[model samples]
Target chain A: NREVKFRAWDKELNMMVYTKEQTGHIEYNTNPADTINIILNQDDYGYVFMQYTGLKDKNEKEIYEGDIIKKSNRSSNLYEIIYQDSIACFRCKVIKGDIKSFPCLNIGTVRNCEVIGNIYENPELLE
Target chain B: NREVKFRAWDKELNMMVYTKEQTGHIEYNTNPADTINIILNQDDYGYVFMQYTGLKDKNEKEIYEGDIIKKSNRSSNLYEIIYQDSIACFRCKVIKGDIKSFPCLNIGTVRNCEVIGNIYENPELLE
Candidate 1:
């Protein structure tokens, strides 16, 4: 089974916050909305939770929602991982100013992708 | 640049149709609907066109819509490629009965996938 883990972004502090740093125990919510609410209630409304995607980047870094990644073989295009609520799954969207975006359907298992940055600390990467 | 190519499945004939076999020159359509309409008018509406995804399988076989593939490292799961008009790109969906489906976003560059069969002639492979 895939490992369940999470890391959060503190809007107030402008940094990533781990579960151990706040509460020792992290609760997993099956409902996406509940997941966010539980994390927010645990601290305050200034936190956004990003769940681990159960897949690692080419560099072996754990991937999560709101993470920005770029394919090593491709130049000038960057992707951001997001939970697509309509499909109830995590998908990558091409950053703006790149070429036309094509749907990618095997991000987790692809070995050519590396985590360059994340949407929180690296919004400029989207440009 | 990725080579532009296409193949089609003929429903009435129950066979795959190639452009070279029908017409020496195939017109490229910018609009998705126009692409299908042009091909249908060229021959008949019974043909379903699947465009090359600009990436190949691990075995070097071309990947296209309606093709079913499985990852080398994973067992008991199959994926089908389709044109997601909403996203204006091709995406893969998990076949029914596989473990809960998660989004895949890098099918093109992934090196661990192989095309097992296509939806046209190998519906049984989905099971």
Candidate 2:
């Protein structure tokens, strides 16, 4: 479902995919949260809590939990995964990741599955 | 939905119609505030607080705000907009944008429609 494009400007640049891939991170908020911080790599895995400390980890990277670190840019490193149940037409979207914000952690199959420049070609494998 | 895109762009170049239109005067946190600034010839909309988006398209001078934008692109866009029943699987998808408390003030037939730009087409009436 290559529907909506993310944080795109020129339309000539290489397009990238976004997802949720971070420590303790989970997925993209359907109803834009009070504060949005798109997670990378982690597609539809683990947790979806928007309540992070907003502090860097032991390595000094900004911690994300959807609290303070809000989604500030038009995201390219995000994959809007679709979730729908034919029974009720129920659905939800999940964000993946870009080239840089990929394969950071280990859990979800969404490791460096960007549509632009990435190693993997078969994103279905990562899914 | 059909709002975001990439590459070189000049809204002034066209007299095309626009949705919400390119985000301007500007707002958003931790994101691309200003790589640079020029101006355009329109008024793009996008009520973030209301989860609303109004903007011009990049490529093709597309003026998609409804029935266009999708998550990572959508599996569908067309849906019931009138009384009850909606479109179909081939030319359909659920969009349902801007869950704001206020009544949708601006354009379109209804809903953030995923009209179409390519192979797909709308039913208008149930077949």
Candidate 3:
């Protein structure tokens, strides 16, 4: 079984938030006023949702989409985490300015990795 | 000027060696005994040669073909360097066991990366 969770970036609040306790990750809102009742059908809510990878980084931080990770090695490599549709896998995007390329290989697990920041928070991390 | 060089994985010797010096990366061998004189036309001779990408890793290390690389990040991300003919660029091959996929994007440069291992020498590195 996979643990599915989501974090949202609230534009108005200019902050990030997630449901503290969800009996179900994806659910139907019983009450419209429920602050935590997220309706995928609501469409544009000025909120960007990031999914959980169900894994933790080397620092024991939760890995999530939109998060940037740095590998522990001499190269001091940094990459942005993203979901690849074609392959249906989480991948690290490598880039230098406008130059974009794929990593040489896939990361082993979340334990060997660490979440440094999120793309939403650190646009300067890339390029 | 870009330094054009090459390294070959000698299966017989089970090791790697570089061409002492090359007047040109691609050339016709005038002498057979000139061990340095490599003919790409030779087809198969238990020799796997890697080409130079004209780049260097962060450690100021000369990056070459078949070298494995690790990014300096918390992910402990490791990748095997390879050449992709389709894209006409050097890309990192990410894999988990038999799972092979491309990085979310391309790598920036060898300078931002580091050479770790080689597919030829460390077959266990991937998967």
Candidate 4:
């Protein structure tokens, strides 16, 4: 539930683009053959803000919390999850950024999720 | 099982934009009071394509299945669920387009859903 989510891209149209921090979110694991499934119901006016719902190594130091991460070179866009490793990288965006901001956490898409922890933990974080 | 998913935005850089048809997504019903929760798991490379899992009025005439729909007069864009009523319009975009394309369905999102009818339905339509 500690996974961070934020509004990354306010698409010039105000149709903002929200994202999750890399530290949290589900990563695809092919080793033990274990995968995660998330379910959520979002409001029409609001978004779901779903990430690989889980806490980072709470023991680690301060993670990265960015609102506008850099893309290739030109367009100044934003990113949600800067996935740390391969597991946190859901949509398989980039796996090169810092541990706190690489995988590009899927921001404004998820509203509610069937995670293993508190569901309402970060409700206000996205709204 | 009747919901359709497609890659509407290829981002020109291969970071495609998937969307859904406006006909079958969930419309937030505030009166009778019943909300829906959908859960899903997409591949790392293969995004989890989860649109509103349901049949669009079933009895309605031929619905629209578009890969790319026009947004404004400038940038060529794609939409997943051109949502309809005041309900399904989650991120609350423009509720102006035609019904088939109105509220805008979200494509390239869900891979599996805990829908009321059936799960694992429409598995390949998104990959």
Candidate 5:
């Protein structure tokens, strides 16, 4: 079964938010005046959401959108994971050494890739 | 004297705009109906402004805010240029290998540094 998960990046705070393990619950903005209704909301200015890909890297690390993965044999090659809505599938875009896009599964097995960093915190890795 | 210049990144277009050489005029959102009042405006969602640092890299390329510089000798070391208002000067933050900050001038002559990429387009190089 494919596991669905999500994380949020707080642009204003320059950090990750809504991580369940650290907070014990998914964090979201709630309407303070409407106490009776616990409605989760996202602020327009602060949050960018990223979804998990339901796949793991070679090291068993969970892969997510905006993640930078390094191919095992190609030292200079790097790819960024992004969800392409047109195809309704996760794809990897060449972020270093080339310009191209391919399905994430085309990398063969998770053992052939490693999650080296992410776009939010590791923005430098993407170009 | 420091030369002041700026460039805008069009987030919606995912490309650089207002480059004088390409357009021969700065691109900005102007009032449509008021021809007499040419007010330049920035939209909340699309544009990000980056300022030139008045410094040049070893390759004689102009360095700007959000540009990534790689130290000549330290292959693994990379830095991102940002303007620190507290000091009223440009500072380089360690984006690879270690975590630290120092004045951009501390890196010695521009000959010792190279502008390998930028944060907007080359986000992968930052962390």
Candidate 6:
């Protein structure tokens, strides 16, 4: 079953907020006192989110777009996880031999994937 | 005028080595004592070489493909410089929203470009 999830960046707080609520548009988290927030989209500034890859890292952390991973099977490669409609599925981005995108399943199992960081927070983990 | 300097990774030493000599093919430096090295090219695992962007970062460092940059003008975006045959010039990859690439010139002046990490060494910086 496909499980949809998302995260948004609080521009004022400089951190990510996780939610499974209705994120069709902008709203303040149901609390008037909180800074105004919105359900993030693909192009929203200061935010990023993605559907669950239906997989989890070795640490049991859910995988999402912008997550950086080091695969146990690929000895010298690091992966940047991303979601794009152009190909219609989650892709593992590889930079070792040029910018290449591989279907998540094509690379290997995600069960042993190591979570390094996400594109929004720890892009340095990609190197 | 374009300065055509190149750098190669010594697989043995695991470090970058600069050269201005003929780098059109795989070859050992004239000095045989050094570990065999080949001129780096895109997609060469463990090696990366790009024609200088003809620009320098704020620290006056030469800019090349795979280099991550933060433009002083664009307060919220980080860019990954790359060389693509389709564009015939350098482009900056941004991840703030969707993964978008903008021409180096179209974005803004490179004089204020801040050098971060490269795609090869510090992919995390792109975020």
- Alpha-carbon interface RMSD for all candidates, in angstroms: 23.1, 16.5, 29.6, 17.8, 22.2, 26.3
Tens-digit per-residue lDDT, B46-127, candidate 2: 1211111232223322232223333224433323221111110112233343332222212332234332432112323222
* Predictions: Cα RMSD each: 19.7, 17.7, 22.9, 18.4, 18.9, 23.4
Q: Which stretches of candidate 2 lie over 4 Å from their true place?
A: A1-117, A120-127, B1-3, B6-24, B27-29, B33-65, B68-127
lDDT of 5 at A124: 76
Clashing pairs in 6: A97-B43, A123-B124, A123-B125, A124-B124, A124-B125
Provide a comma-separated list of chain B TM-scores, one per candidate.
0.74, 0.18, 0.70, 0.21, 0.73, 0.63
Say which prediction, candidate 2 or candidate 6, comes out ahead on DockQ. 2
User: Which candidate would rank higher by DockQ, 1 or 3?
Assistant: 1
Q: How well is candidate 3 docked (DockQ)?
A: 0.01
lDDT tens digits by residue: candidate 1, A1-127? 1233456776866877643334332334222222222333454446566656656778877778788888787577788887553342456888854667535435434467888889888877866
Off by over 4 Å in 5: A18-45, A100-107, B1-127
Candidate 3, residues A1-127: lDDT per residue as tens digits? 1233457665655666654321112322221111122232233655565656545677767777788876654445677776543232456686433334444323244446667788887777866
Model 4 lDDT per residue over B33-125, tens place: 111111122134333333322322223221122222234334333333332211212221222243343332333221211111111233233
Write candidate 5's Cα lDDT for A1-127 as tens digits.
Answer: 1232456666766776543312222222321111101111324535555656667778878777788888787567888877543222456778887564433343254557899988889977756
Which residue pairs show backbone clashes in model 5? A123-B123, A123-B124, A124-B123, A124-B124, A124-B125, A124-B126, A125-B124, A125-B125, A126-B124
| lDDT (Cα, tens digit) per residue for candidate 2, span A78-112 | 43222121211111123444434322211122222
Ranking by lDDT: 1, 5, 3, 6, 4, 2
Q: Candidates' TM-scores?
A: 0.43, 0.18, 0.40, 0.18, 0.40, 0.37
Give every collision pair in model 1: A104-B105, A105-B104, A106-B104, A106-B105, A107-B105, A107-B106
Q: Encode model 6's per-residue lDDT on A1-127: one tens digit a residue.
A: 1232344544544665554321223322221101111122223354433434545777878776667777766666677766432222356778444454444433246766787777667645545
lDDT of model 6 at residue A94? 86
Model 4 regions lying over 4 Å from their true place? A1-50, A53-127, B1-17, B20-22, B28-127
Q: How far in Å is the alpha carbon of B109 misplaced in model 4?
A: 24
List candidate 6 stretches off by more than 4 Å: A19-38, A42-45, A96-103, A106-108, B1-127
